[PDB]
Amino acid sequence: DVSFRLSGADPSSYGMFIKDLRNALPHTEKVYNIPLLLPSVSGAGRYLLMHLFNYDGNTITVAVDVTNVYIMGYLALTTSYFFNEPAADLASQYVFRSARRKITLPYSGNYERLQIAAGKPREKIPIGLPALDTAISTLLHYDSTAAAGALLVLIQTTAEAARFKYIEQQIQERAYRDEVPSSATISLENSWSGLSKQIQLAQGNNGVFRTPTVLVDSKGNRVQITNVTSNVVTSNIQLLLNTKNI
């Protein structure tokens, strides 16, 4: 398991958490020096538990699928909550079994459905360590509309930061003040599957992408990524979704 405490949190301790999170995801291979997530893992070993504590020391435990860094559900006090999708339903067979009751959330975990449930796109939802503190607090007490927004915050400040150093740094910049994600952040989140695939396809193609990936950079400019020499590949992305899962 990995842990993060918002009480006394700073960019350093958050950085240590994102490092622990990355290091808890198993891999047997690196592709262009980036860890390649496994095609599959059977049984309970598929799920990592993240223990998150809000500023007051209250805690939720979040279950993460280690093959794709997708959040499946979470435990708050004696109640478990899972996304309304088959992967989460499967996860509920292995994690938080000791919960007194299990609630299935009225949405799946993808961004489109969460944004619908939350009533806003995540372009308009501030993120940062204070927002994560809030998200944790919100998830302690069931409110499915509030939870959708909290989960958008949670996903981005955890999984997405694990996947991209740029996003980790974005959150570190928001250690004491929330701010909506940069469009570069949104772009990277939306492109993780695509990038993961093209980096793998580049292996037998002299480092060249079979299909270019379009991203928005830090200045808001739309750029094409065509090969593994790009800074997105050499410096930014930290985890690859296995093509077997794409």
Ligand X SMILES: O=c1ccn([C@@H]2O[C@H](COP(=O)(O)OP(=O)(O)O)[C@@H](O)[C@H]2O)c(=O)[nH]1
Ligand Y SMILES: *[C@@H]1O[C@H](CO)[C@@H](O)[C@H](O)[C@H]1NC(C)=O
**Residues within window 175-234 making contact with ligand Y, judged by CB under 6 A:** 208, 226-227, 229-230
List 2, 21, 62, 72, residue binding ligand X (CB under 6 A)? 72
239 binds, among ligand X, ligand Y, none (CB under 5 to 8 A by kind): none
Burial class (CB in 10 A: 0-12, 13-18, 19+), 39: exposed
Q: How far is the CB of 14 from ligand Y (least distance, A)?
A: 30
Identify the DSSP state of 237: B
117 binds, among ligand Y, ligand X, none (CB under 5 to 8 A by kind): none
Token reading at 154? 């949670």
226 binds, among ligand X, ligand Y, none (CB under 5 to 8 A by kind): ligand Y
Q: How far is the CB of 189 from ligand X (least distance, A)?
A: 7
Cα–Cα distance measured from residue 98 to residue 222, given in angstroms and rounded to the nearest whole number: 48
Q: Among 29, 123, 160, 168, which one carries the catalytic annotation?
A: 160
List 32, 53, 94, 111, residue binding ligand X (CB under 6 A)? 111
Q: For 76-104, give one letter per residue: b (16+ CB within 10 A) or e.
A: beebbbbbebebbeebbeebbeebeeeee
The residue type found at 34 is I
Cα–Cα distance measured from residue 55 to residue 70, given in angstroms and rounded to the nearest whole number: 25
3-state helix, strand, coil in the chain (%, to 5): 45, 25, 30
Q: Is residue 240 near ligand X by the rule CB under 6 A?
A: no
Q: Among all chains, which residue has been given the structure tokens 């930290």? A: 238
Binding site members for UTP:
69, 71, 111, 160, 163
Query: Catalytic: 160?
Result: yes
Site size with ligand Y, rule: CB under 6 A:
5
Residues contributing to the site for ligand X (CB under 6 A)? 69-72, 83, 85, 87-88, 108-112, 155, 159
